[PDB]
Design an enzyme around this catalytic site. Structure first.
Site, PDB file in Angstrom:
ATOM      1  N   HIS A   1       0.851  -1.178   0.000  1.00 43.53           N
ATOM      2  CA  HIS A   1       0.000   0.000   0.000  1.00 43.53           C
ATOM      3  C   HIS A   1       0.891   1.233   0.000  1.00 43.53           C
ATOM      4  CE1 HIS A   1      -3.517   2.441   0.510  1.00 43.53           C
ATOM      5  NE2 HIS A   1      -3.114   2.912   1.675  1.00 43.53           N
ATOM      6  N   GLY A   2       0.689   2.112  -0.980  1.00 46.49           N
ATOM      7  CA  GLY A   2       1.609   3.223  -1.161  1.00 46.49           C
ATOM      8  C   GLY A   2       1.632   4.177   0.016  1.00 46.49           C
ATOM      9  N   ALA A   3       0.454   4.533   0.528  1.00 46.60           N
ATOM     10  CA  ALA A   3       0.377   5.571   1.552  1.00 46.60           C
ATOM     11  C   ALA A   3       0.966   5.117   2.880  1.00 46.60           C
ATOM     12  CB  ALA A   3      -1.073   6.012   1.742  1.00 46.60           C
ATOM     13  N   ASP A   4       1.101   3.811   3.090  1.00 49.04           N
ATOM     14  CA  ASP A   4       1.599   3.311   4.364  1.00 49.04           C
ATOM     15  C   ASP A   4       3.098   3.065   4.379  1.00 49.04           C
ATOM     16  OD1 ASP A   4      -0.739   3.294   5.907  1.00 49.04           O
ATOM     17  OD2 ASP A   4      -1.350   1.337   5.135  1.00 49.04           O
ATOM     18  N   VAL A   5       3.651   2.447   3.339  1.00 47.95           N
ATOM     19  CA  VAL A   5       4.971   1.848   3.472  1.00 47.95           C
ATOM     20  C   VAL A   5       5.972   2.347   2.440  1.00 47.95           C
ATOM     21  CG1 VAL A   5       3.972  -0.181   4.514  1.00 47.95           C
ATOM     22  CG2 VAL A   5       4.324  -0.101   2.060  1.00 47.95           C
ATOM     23  N   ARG A   6       5.525   3.146   1.471  1.00 48.40           N
ATOM     24  CA  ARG A   6       6.436   3.554   0.406  1.00 48.40           C
ATOM     25  C   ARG A   6       7.587   4.391   0.945  1.00 48.40           C
ATOM     26  NH1 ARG A   6       4.459   4.595  -5.709  1.00 48.40           N
ATOM     27  NH2 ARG A   6       2.768   3.273  -4.902  1.00 48.40           N
TER      28      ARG A   6
ATOM     29  N   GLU B   1      -5.106  -6.919  -6.366  1.00 48.65           N
ATOM     30  CA  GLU B   1      -3.777  -7.498  -6.524  1.00 48.65           C
ATOM     31  C   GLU B   1      -3.614  -8.736  -5.656  1.00 48.65           C
ATOM     32  OE1 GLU B   1      -0.361  -4.559  -6.644  1.00 48.65           O
ATOM     33  OE2 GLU B   1      -2.060  -3.176  -6.749  1.00 48.65           O
TER      34      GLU B   1
END
Lengths: 516, 520, 516
Positions: free
Chosen positions: C8-13, C74
């Site tokens: 998830h982009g907003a959490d872990v990127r 996904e």
């Protein structure tokens, strides 16, 4: 005692203390075992003295450790003995936060408040001062540890490790005459000059260079921030080092892993040692260095070790020290006759310097040993547990053949010589033991290049020239006369052999199979 | 049958994974047991199916029963699977009732019952039934109650001993089952040990090479070490020690480091000074075996005084040289003797035919090969193994090959013992082997007197157990004489500046004279 | 791809995915990098196909993984590809309990409920089936791990380890004729008889015993619960084993540590192997066994390995197999001429069986190589990258002297012989290559004990007797004729030397310094 365990019975006796004691038992640690002398009374003596005479103290803190004036008194006594006597106190926080102990809050604080009712002010102050001192010292926390078995194994290993290194070394009290050595060294070390001075110790094989270096390390190293001792560098260095750079890199890796306590070190370039040691005082002892490459690997410039550092290279040949530019060099000297006799009597009569009635033979064997601590040790050990008739019966073989324990080392020092140096060694052993060097040059000069030969021999400390006269130690001349029966001397290429054996020339002269 | 794990432990990790299960697992590991550990389930693999397959393939299931055991669904599912596998596959189920009683387990009352009720609310109707019936089935087993022991270390030791007995019930034989006539050895050693004397006796065991000093030491250790607080056995000290020994102190420090790493269970010790064994073993009953010392540095590193060890300790040094034992002041020495002719035949037959008695028709040639082997167990073993699968003609035409060539596995060991001598001792050994085997000591001294010091040489050879003097005549074992006669063909005897050799043979070495190429 | 990362982009990127990707990059792992094709739309193709063509899938689950239908789609596709295609899916629970994912409760459950509004029933069912399947598979939990750096290093190491062993071996496709070997073996193994059958493979040195054993292991081992292959037991066993029991114990330690995957094993008695392996099917390959003691150390009774076990001993002498009572023995045979040519052309023309126009010289060199795969490999490798004139110029030396790569191995097999066996080998090489054994006995019988000698030679596979005629491989007879120039034959003790060298007897016969 070994360990004095302080704990709370109602909390930990059944569950965790049993496992801890089992681990200690299988590790050979015997803790004090209170017999419940007074379950709820004062501690009294024989519980204060037990704390006093314990090498290690272990406090096992739990939620109700403060709900018993017994445990609080034990803790106060433990910390008092930690301050005055210098006891070692290890803390175990069993399901208690150290913060709750330091500030005495939470359930621990509730228990401590309940206990401290009716007690006088001074008692409470001693208890809480002890508590807040305990909570700060670095121990083991139950909450942090993955499982109790691993924590208990770690605690047992740590206690065992301290008990191993609790006392200082005393095996070096059996050495004789180390004060002369230390006094000659401290003139060279000059430990107050905060330079990076490098000191060389040189001498014949088996004279005491390694023992001197070890004694100096044990005395001084504690003055130095980071210290290590490299033993037998000559032995661990491959002779056919086809890729010398790899050997150099692993030698510096060995030194660095030993010194900065990172056993898992693998280095890339040869300048890692400079990077690590440039800003810390270092006491480094390199023992039995044979050639320049490995000095370059370990200590090449004084810029590498930083201020107040001392690097001590014990070697056997002077040319290595001169090449690397040491200049401060110690020539170890043979001990006096009385110290020689003391060494022999250590090694022959069981650590007893007075002779046991074998004084007559003891002096003959000593004189046979020259003055080397190696020869004295070997000869003394070869004769311990004997009786006097056994001494007389062993003596002739001990006199007509040197022990292999000495011969092996002398051979190893004799295998590093050029062939002409070997031939000059043999000539000096058999014929020219104490002769003017000028006459030796006049006699052997047509073929031996004696002037370079004597130079190399003296540098390797297989000879010494005093008042223009050559001198070789008797325990080396015996090796030479022995070798002169199985080895030859080639001048151009003709083979000549020296004939010096007593009662061994009679049968060779009564022969027809000869060469003239 | 085929199993993949000896023990499968079922527990509730939130209660016991930290405190008691860790100790149980470490105890199992120390007792040579391999349990299933859910932390080593290979990653990227579904946990449920792997747990099922691990339950099915485990011989013993152990069920820790905490009060929150019924709160989880993994616990109940694997308990049901354990019960089904016990009923259907003959696996052994053991229970431990950790701070809860079977009364609550089997009826779901109050403690451990509320967890079951809260975990069984949202389920099917038959899953609840399976879980319940599994609960009553497990609770009727008799296991271990935590509250009946005053400490948990003893309970865990009891559990591990029970599991080890249950797993190790096959035990057809031990490594010491093919040994012959060692009750005699153990009786003679018991007279020397005197295990109820609370002194610190050091006991020596001396014999020729290949007389089995090592096997006697191993057997004695595995028989007696149980009753001492700490114990260690160090094997082949002679081989690990440096041969030139350029630095004695480092070698001694390393050897004592090994001794303490094995005696104390501290597996990675770094000794700093030779005085640690003094300070750690001074109040403890200690049993220590030093398998092969060659010189006195080993003894000074490992056991210098009886003051290093505590009351009741026994230290047992096996050696080939008596001078080493005399120098250290041992005075309690066991001279290992050759086994009787009957026991020697038993050893040879055990190594050749696999049984104490020969196969039919082999007896005559078997006894001939025996007589070739002397009496040393080493020679008997080597010659017996050299003929394990062969048949009669191979025996008959390999015996002449045995007579005329000493086996490599005996020659190498005798060579290692021979290379430790002096030059004059080596020359005396060669002379005795080639020429003066059974002759008088007086005559040998008279003949070889001018070349070397015969009397002291004989004394040292007897000290080293290479020869033996019985009635004024010297003796060598047949194998030692064979080795000497072989090495006579390559070794040169230097008396003074000269050089000599010995010609020994039946008729074969008479053609060396006809070489006309080498000096005579 | 190497790895397809689902996150998830907003959490872990920003925080953890960057570190994970850095670790992958320094470990040589290249993951799929989405370019934000559609930040909040459907996945579509080229995002479904990227999942399809990824060897490993990595799901990184966080608190808001369920608040994006993108990530849920996904995940559903990832698990579908895990079921059908057989993809490898590794889960990382970043500050989320697996229980909260399986049951979709907590904050994860709140997010998933918020997402699933307005969505149809089938989509929600696919999403939650995927979720509950994901939560069960064994992954990495952030809460359990001590620090993130260690967890990330462990994850990277595991992914690297699977990528290393993702594909099966294909280096054994370059071998020629393994079907005959496997067909002869499976007649002996009889893998359905659930006995503890022990199989012996014997043959001349360099015939293919080790390669056959490795191929058989790679084919079969996966059928067996616990399997290991011990390579070159002869080499790793000390010849002067003064204490054989210690060597035996460490050999069994090696076997056991290799087999039961406990690398940290130290055993006390020799019956540990029985204790461990009595209840499990075992496929054990002991390679290059030279003597009985080490067979006893590793596999002494069939009682030790338990049901369905197969122990395969590859050896060079038959006497060892007969002594230990194997009975099922495979005599490896030389490959046919066409397979020999294929092996030579592998090793001379770069994995190309058709000749590159050098067919004429290729057959002459092959015929020079006899039939050994070792000789064929050595001769082919000695000639690769040459041109035809280079082949003709190399040929005479290749013909008048065998390569050291073959000579070293034949010498090692020839150093284990009794002196009379060596003398019989030399006689058979130089004079009696293909002669009736009866005549050989009639000629050499007065001094050589030929009848035992031929027996030992045949058992060691340095000779074979067919139709009452002895035969030695040409590549061994060449070694013999070479050795007959630097080694002698002593009958009583007189030294005789065989004279067979072509054009080497002319100069020796034209001499005065002889012995007749």
């Amino acid at each position: 005692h070994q360990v004095f365990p302080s704990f709370h019975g109602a909390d930990v006796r059944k569950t965790i203390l049993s496992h801890i004691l089992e681990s200690f038992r299988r590790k050979g640690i015997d803790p004090f075992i209170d017999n419940n002398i007074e379950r709820s009374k004062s501690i009294g003596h024989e519980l204060k003295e037990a704390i006093k005479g314990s090498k290690i103290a272990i406090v096992l803190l739990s939620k109700n450790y403060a709900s018993s004036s017994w445990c609080l008194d034990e803790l106060a006594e433990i910390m008092k003995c930690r301050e005055l006597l210098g006891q070692i106190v290890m803390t175990i926080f069993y399901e208690v936060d150290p913060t709750d102990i330091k500030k005495q809050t939470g359930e621990f604080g509730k228990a401590f408040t309940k206990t401290c009712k009716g007690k006088t002010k001074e008692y409470v102050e001693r208890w809480r001062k002890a508590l807040e001192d305990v909570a700060t010292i670095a121990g083991y926390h139950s909450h942090k540890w993955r499982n109790e078995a691993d924590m208990i194994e770690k605690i047992a290993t740590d206690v065992s490790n301290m008990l191993n290194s609790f006392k200082p070394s005393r095996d070096f009290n059996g050495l004789v005459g180390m004060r002369a050595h230390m006094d000659m060294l401290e003139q060279l070390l000059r430990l107050v000059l905060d330079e990076v001075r490098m000191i060389g110790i040189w001498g014949p094989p088996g004279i005491g260079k390694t023992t001197i270096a070890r004694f100096l390390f044990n005395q001084v190293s504690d003055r130095f921030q980071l210290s290590a001792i490299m033993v037998n560098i000559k032995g661990c260095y491959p002779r056919p080092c086809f890729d010398e750079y790899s050997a150099q890199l692993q030698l510096q890796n060995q030194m660095l892993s030993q010194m900065i306590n990172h056993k898992d070190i693998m280095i890339s370039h040869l300048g890692v040692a400079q990077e690590r040691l440039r800003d810390k005082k270092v006491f480094l002892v390199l023992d039995e260095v044979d050639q320049l490459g490995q000095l370059d690997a370990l200590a090449k410039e004084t810029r590498w070790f930083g201020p107040g550092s001392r690097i001590i290279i014990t070697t056997e040949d002077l040319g290595v020290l001169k090449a690397h530019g040491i200049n401060h060099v110690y020539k170890v000297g043979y001990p006096s006759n009385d110290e020689a006799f003391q060494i022999f009597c250590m090694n022959a009569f069981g650590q007893k310097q007075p002779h046991e009635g074998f004084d007559e033979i003891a002096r003959e064997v000593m004189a046979l040993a020259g003055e080397l601590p190696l020869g004295l040790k070997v000869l003394g050990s070869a004769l311990r547990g004997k009786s006097k008739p056994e001494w007389e019966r062993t003596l002739p073989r001990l006199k007509t053949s040197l022990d292999g324990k000495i011969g092996s080392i002398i051979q190893f020092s004799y295998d590093a010589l050029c062939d002409e140096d070997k031939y000059l060694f043999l000539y000096i052993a058999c014929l020219f033991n104490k002769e003017s060097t000028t006459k030796v040059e006049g006699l052997l000069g047509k073929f031996l290049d004696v002037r370079q030969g004597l130079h190399i021999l003296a540098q390797k400390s297989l000879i010494s020239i005093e008042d223009g006269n050559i001198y070789m130690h008797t325990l080396l001349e015996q090796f030479g006369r022995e070798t002169s029966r199985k080895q030859f001397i080639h001048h151009g290429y003709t083979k000549h052999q020296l004939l010096v054996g007593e009662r061994d020339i009679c049968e060779v002269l009564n022969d027809d199979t000869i060469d003239s």
